[PDB]
Write a protein that binds this ligand. Structure first.
Ligand SMILES: [Mg+2]
Ligand SMILES: [Mg+2]
Ligand SMILES: [Mg+2]
Lengths: 434, 130, 104, 434, 434
């Protein structure tokens, strides 16, 4: 009735034209679940690694046929016969079946696809919404969106070291209003960039990568777009950063060389000077979030940055924690960062994703459910964000259905919740003080 | 001061009924079937004010006033999913209640009755329905 | 209506006699109108879309309605329209009148 | 059990950040269907118009709350009670309830959303795939895709007057191989443009808009990308054009002015000169498709172009025919074009879409199911193409999930069909001799 | 089939012999849920009040016929027709229908009984365990039990001012072993009290209330029982205190007068002296938690106590926060305590209970789901503790089944969880360091 009868994987395309896989789960009564895996990384020291074919004559070595065969010929036989509502048991069985810390034998993509498909099939069997199945009865908080609007760093050729600039409409009454505000600021920025003769064609996440003079130019243009849309910066819409400082960090010189992206006249700053630069940016602009402000190995720099700025601006560790429970626990013990970026494919299963989210929540940190560069039409991360009541999501810009699908799912969730739906905005930043 | 004088109540009926509400087609909303009892009471009271003095006509005037305040709130016509209350707007625009308040002797009572006759006459003039 | 429900036989009769495919539409005064003017009036707000249409007619004198059931404290099923109710009926009103010439 | 008990529309976003709507249909037994509407045009004399709010405060006048209320208040009361498998009856009831030729009262978006949601709910009730429900048991043909890869005209600042350039992998054995070839050519072109220093960001349809020297430069770079991926131009992969010649048409002088897009020195061409230019392009390059080669009102030019090139080149009428049965019938009678571009939202109803496809097929024309600039995660047009056995689809490039979703659905359909699945490729161009 | 059809209420007895109510909910398909209410307080400025009949002829004025009639006549007609899985909507509807901030119109007992009955009926309809329905798929943590061993204060004639002494077997590997250790220490202490001539009769919560020579004698006897059972104090089993300082606090002189419970020769301490005395007790004994260490209105003293001992010792606010959202927010903002005692009948609704639990969790506080002095055979708070993964519970001693029922429910939950179940023990005290 709920016993899993069929587990079947196939190879599909992601939003970047690269192969990924999807897994379909069928039970006895006809309950159906489909999980599509976002594209992650096949290399990593302590992050779950996805399995790639490595056949240079097929998709440039990015095929996912090996992981499809792993699902169809290994995982399917182990999982068929389980109860579809035994998500923790199935995920534990798959982890034990892989037998390696980084899920390299079967592939983290294969395991994640089976986990998502099983969870969705169980929600289909129970005839409950997916967020209701995942987070229980008390799921009401619509996450505060952190919408990427301008790209820098290695995502653009402009002289900007920081990788992402984002708008956070934390002053909106509802999620529907926040989405409308974000879309209107997006279109106002599009108009402003057209007037200035800058490029408008969008990147991987749907945001622009224009030719700016620097970080201050981009932040000021974002402020101008916010005001052109008709909203107050620092009251209605705030600014978030994704510096990705690990890209321009000299390991042996222990400096943050901005010259890699900002020309030979840029500022090569130490960890302390980087802290003062971030503090200057926070005191100058309505910046409420900074992501990857220090290198993934600059633990002392992260602790000093948290001491200096951890009470007024959210500090998110993306590569600092790489959704690893061990790294998150060490960072909590050492008072480094106050927020973790949750990526479901960098850990492997939904059980461990929720374990990381609850460990971050129990320590006062904020969990930000995040997209990847290669996404799909699957919008499970919106259901994860609502189910955990995380209160924050980072699912891209307002310009591609790889990103807009999550916003549409959040709109559907808010409509379904109705009068019990809650949008908290600045209250979602419970890691901050006042 | 007084709202009704012998030189203006006729002209006052013009301004009272020309501003009454109307359907989109232009016809009136009030009909004679709604103000029938009020006109009957006014006519009877005017008829009795000739022979019988005012010290025992106070109760008839109070009955006329309570009847006005009843028929104003009772009658309603619903057109195009929109309800309207024509007798109340007739009383409001024509200042019927305020005129009833100033009735203190035979002369003002007869002036008020003639004002009511003017109102119904001119309402019939501009296409009012029975 | 809580004491009763739509019967299954009437629902089936309405289903494959296809009475819902032959709806009639009315304006605010209850006069029959085409679906185009019904849509026009509903859009402009001159018609209430809820109480302004009918599902044709089901042929065959079928009962429209069946009793609805509920659970007692014992966990048994019981009709919703039966129970303690009340207790006030008197006997009758015997009015004598033993003089009326009753026609045969 | 199949009786519709709920029709509910809600306003969501599209792939460009502009509002659209989605409809959900629930039947008595719990069968569920969801239809999302691609964004079309609210203006046009001889095509179905969409209903926009026009309130400049909300979304810049592009809100869809009016059409959502038309579904929830007008269409819902009429449709609730119908059998969900009565697609034609529901569609004709909606058309009669609208009463206008252009569906401007209810909105074409509203009617199309209800039509798609009803078709999907009927397929869900019958527990059959959507293409099987739409087209019957004999659904086997996988469309040959025309993948947009380079954009010019109004979508690029380069001196190119042709709006779109496309690759057609008609030499593939299966659709899976065709998709792999398209993705590899896309990535090879991306590498070539990166080496050339041209911009690599994608547009609305997922393709690049580089600054080429001209049309010949763009076609030559496309051929270089095809050969860099290891495929033969003219045998494995062909080239299609979307000229959109109505954009640079000087109607007053009855001349085609390339000076609008290709600079001040661009050549000026009459109808005969435009035919000669298209023929020269066909002879020089492996061009198998030309779309909107003439203006939507140049009927004599269309007749001359079909007489000259119709025996060996597919000529598609997009603005010429506007998914109109009357315009298509007139073109069939006058031997104008040999193909029609089918957009479901330009006609507003699945019944009329299938009527137009059947009319095109019965006259030897090919029907090409197409996308719009703003799409959704809805991939119904793939099921429409497979259900009709149309043999051709045009659903964008290989770079955004608004486009990748249709290719993923086609991959799923091909996997479902198994051995039955057919990919004609060059044989799907049955309008061409030999 | 999930529509709430019947809501019945009746008057039953609690563990103290005083009346309470129970509510049964039948849905359309026959799903059944029974919720019993623990006895609470009908008076209180900022806690939910329960409705008593006030008839001194019946049950000494403690009958619950008025609230039973409120459920049977008022609440039942409002709730019937709702979906049984719409717990948040049902709870909001009951709160709105009461129309009082402290739920004094209908009674908190009535609303809580309907909430519990609805949640259990929804879990029965879905055929899922109650903790799975309440907390979702990621419910695995078996709470660490702080179980009462010795009583004092107003619950005993001993010269001890501290209300409760508790044992916490946080060194146990599993919850089964923790329960076994608690039972064996309970029996060893019973033997020790018997060999000393002290009375071994149990109180309301199941613990002993013997006469000692003071607090130090009580803690010494508990440590001796821990060693006699074979376990190491400070590694296997820890000591918890519940001072209930509001009982022996004089607000006029702002001193904690131990002379109320310890006799004429007792010492009178100020806020600083009280904090010093708690610090000396912590440094002398393996005390891991102190509950109500300072008066409920002494915010400065609570802040000083958290400044001194709040890093290494858990500080639970029972009367300090009274399970109130506003008090919890004020304490979080003011850095007062690091734990909250959650009593479900102090608010009267499961939705608000879970909201308070998540609010405490997000601030780094621990939520301790607590029993009441008058309890029932209902064991829902065990499922509440597991569903929220709170990691700590407080359900009395190891005697009366009004306590043992919750432990049996936790044993059942651990057995169903199997290999998934986690007993964190000392790791569930995440509000502390290292
Ligand atoms: Mg990053
Ligand atoms: Mg076109
Ligand atoms: Mg207490």
């Amino acid at each position: 009735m709920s016993i899993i009868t069929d587990v079947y994987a196939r190879e599909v395309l992601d939003s970047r034209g690269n192969p990924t896989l999807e897994v379909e789960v069928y039970t006895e009564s006809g309950a159906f679940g489909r999980g599509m895996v976002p594209s992650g990384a096949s290399t990593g020291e302590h992050e779950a690694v996805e399995l790639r074919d490595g056949d240079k004559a097929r998709y440039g070595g990015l095929g996912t046929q090996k992981a499809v065969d792993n699902v169809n010929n290994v995982i399917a036989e182990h999982i068929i016969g389980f109860d579809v509502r035994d998500q923790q048991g199935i995920d534990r069985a798959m982890i034990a079946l892989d037998g390696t810390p980084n899920k390299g034998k079967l592939g983290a993509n294969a395991i994640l696809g089976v986990s998502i498909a099983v969870a969705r099939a169980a929600a289909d069997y129970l005839e409950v919404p997916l967020y209701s199945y995942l987070g229980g009865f008390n799921t009401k908080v619509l996450p505060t969106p952190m919408m990427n609007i301008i790209n820098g760093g290695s995502h653009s050729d402009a002289p900007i070291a920081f990788q992402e600039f984002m708008i956070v409409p934390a002053g909106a009454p509802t999620f529907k209003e926040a989405l409308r505000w974000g879309a209107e600021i997006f279109h106002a920025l599009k108009k402003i960039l057209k007037e200035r003769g800058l490029e408008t064609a969008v990147g991987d996440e749907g945001g622009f990568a224009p030719r700016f003079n620097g970080t201050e130019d981009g932040v000021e243009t974002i402020i101008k777009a916010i005001e052109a849309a008709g909203y107050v910066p620092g009251k209605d819409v705030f600014i978030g950063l994704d510096c990705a400082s690990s890209e321009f960090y000299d390991a042996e010189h222990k400096v943050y060389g901005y010259t890699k992206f900002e020309g030979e006249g840029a500022a090569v700053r130490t960890a302390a000077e980087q802290i003062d630069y971030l503090e200057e940016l926070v005191n100058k602009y309505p910046i409420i979030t900074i992501e990857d402000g220090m290198d993934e190995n600059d633990w002392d720099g992260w602790k000093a940055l948290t001491e200096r700025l951890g009470g007024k601006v959210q500090l998110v560790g993306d590569d600092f924690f790489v959704t690893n429970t061990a790294y998150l626990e060490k960072g909590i013990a050492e008072h480094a960062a106050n927020s973790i970026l949750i990526k479901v494919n960098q850990i492997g299963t939904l059980t461990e994703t929720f374990d990381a989210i609850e460990m971050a929540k129990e320590a006062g940190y904020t969990a930000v459910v995040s997209h990847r560069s290669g996404e799909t039409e699957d919008s499970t991360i919106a259901d994860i964000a609502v189910a955990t009541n995380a209160g924050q999501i980072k699912t891209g810009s307002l310009s591609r259905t790889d990103r807009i699908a999550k916003y549409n799912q959040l709109l559907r969730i808010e409509d379904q919740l109705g009068e019990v739906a809650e949008y908290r905005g600045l209250k979602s930043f419970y890691n901050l003080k006042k | 001061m007084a709202i009704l004088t012998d030189e203006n109540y006729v002209d006052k009926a013009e301004r009272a009924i020309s501003l009454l509400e109307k359907d989109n087609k232009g016809n009136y909303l009030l009909t004679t079937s709604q103000i029938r009892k009020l006109l009957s009471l006014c006519s009877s009271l005017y008829d009795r004010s000739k022979e019988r003095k005012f010290d025992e006509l106070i109760n008839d005037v109070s009955y006329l006033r309570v009847q006005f305040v009843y028929q104003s709130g009772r009658n309603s016509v619903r057109v195009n999913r929109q309800t309207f209350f024509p007798v109340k707007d007739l009383v409001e625009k024509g200042q019927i209640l305020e005129a009833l308040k100033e009735i203190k002797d035979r002369e003002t009572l007869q002036r008020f009755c003639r004002y009511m006759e003017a109102l119904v006459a001119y309402f019939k003039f501009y296409g009012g329905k029975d | 209506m809580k004491n009763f429900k739509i019967s299954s036989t009437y629902r089936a009769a309405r289903k494959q006699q296809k009475t819902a495919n032959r709806k009639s539409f009315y304006n605010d005064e209850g006069y029959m109108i085409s679906p185009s003017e019904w849509a026009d009036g509903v859009i402009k707000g001159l018609i209430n879309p809820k109480n302004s249409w009918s599902n044709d007619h089901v042929k065959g004198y079928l009962p429209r309605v069946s009793p609805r059931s509920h659970w007692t404290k014992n966990g048994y099923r019981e009709y919703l329209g039966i129970g303690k109710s009340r207790d006030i009926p008197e006997k009758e009103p015997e009015v004598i009148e033993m003089m009326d010439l009753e026609l045969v």
